[PDB]
Amino acid sequence: KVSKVPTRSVIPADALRYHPRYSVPRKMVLSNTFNVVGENNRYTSLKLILEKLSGHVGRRQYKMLCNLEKHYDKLKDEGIDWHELKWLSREELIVLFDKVLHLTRTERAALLPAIEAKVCGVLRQTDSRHSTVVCMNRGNANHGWRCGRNGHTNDVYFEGKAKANTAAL
C-alpha cells in the first residue's frame, strides 16, 4: 500500500506561511498594562500605524520619505484616538488636517490609505510579550470599524483584553 499525502484543491495563501517547526506558533497574552483602557493605553495603536507608515516598505525596503511620527504628539494632545479618527467625517478631517495637524499634501497622501481602509487598531497577540502587530483588516460600521473578526467587537482595543468602557474614557 502507498498512502497519498492529504492535500487540498483550494488553499488560502495564509497556510503557505513558514514556521520553523511547521506548527502553530505561540500566542502569548499581552502585558498587564493593557488590562484597562486608559489614556496611556489609548494611543499605542495610533503610534504603531504611524510608525509603519514612515518606515521601510517591502522586500527592497523602500524608505517612506514623509515622516508621520511627528504628528503623533499633537494627535494625542488633542485626545483623539485612532479608533476615534475613523469616526470623524470628511468635513471633520479637513478641519483636523489643515488647522490642527498642518498635514502637507504628501503627508496627507501617505496617511489616507490607512483612513480609507478603516484599519482596526487592535493589538494582535504574538509569540513575544511586546506586540507590534496591528490587525490590518478593513473595519465595518456595524462593529465600530473593528472588522468584526477574531473577537474585535465594537470596543475591543486589545486582543485578549476587555472592552473600551466609554463611561470612563
- Stretch 91-110 residues interacting with other proteins (CB under 8 A): 93-94, 104-110
* Residue in the structure block whose three cell numbers are 473595519: 139
Binding-site member from 47, 83, 118, 152 for other proteins (CB under 8 A)? 118
Regarding 141 and contact with other proteins (CB under 8 A), the answer is yes
Q: What nine digits make up the cell of 10?
A: 483550494
Regarding 119 and contact with Zn ion (CB under 5 A), the answer is no
Binding-site member from 30, 46, 119, 120 for Zn ion (CB under 5 A)? 120
Q: Which amino acid is at 75?
A: L
Regarding 86 and contact with other proteins (CB under 8 A), the answer is yes
74: CB partners within 8 A, 6+ apart? 100, 101
- Interacting partner of 104 out of other proteins, Zn ion, none (Cβ under 5 to 8 A depending on kind): other proteins
What sections of 15-161 are H helices per DSSP?
Answer: 39-42, 44-52, 72-77, 82-86, 90-95, 107-116
What is the dihedral angle through the alpha carbons of 97, 101, 104, 106, rounded to the nearest 10 degrees? -80
Distance CA 17, CA 20 (A): 10
Regarding 147 and contact with Zn ion (CB under 5 A), the answer is yes
Which residues would be at the binding site for other proteins (CB under 8 A)?
16-18, 20, 52-53, 56-66, 86, 90, 93-94, 104-119, 136, 138-141, 145, 147
Which residues would be at the binding site for Zn ion (CB under 5 A)?
120, 122, 135, 137, 147, 152
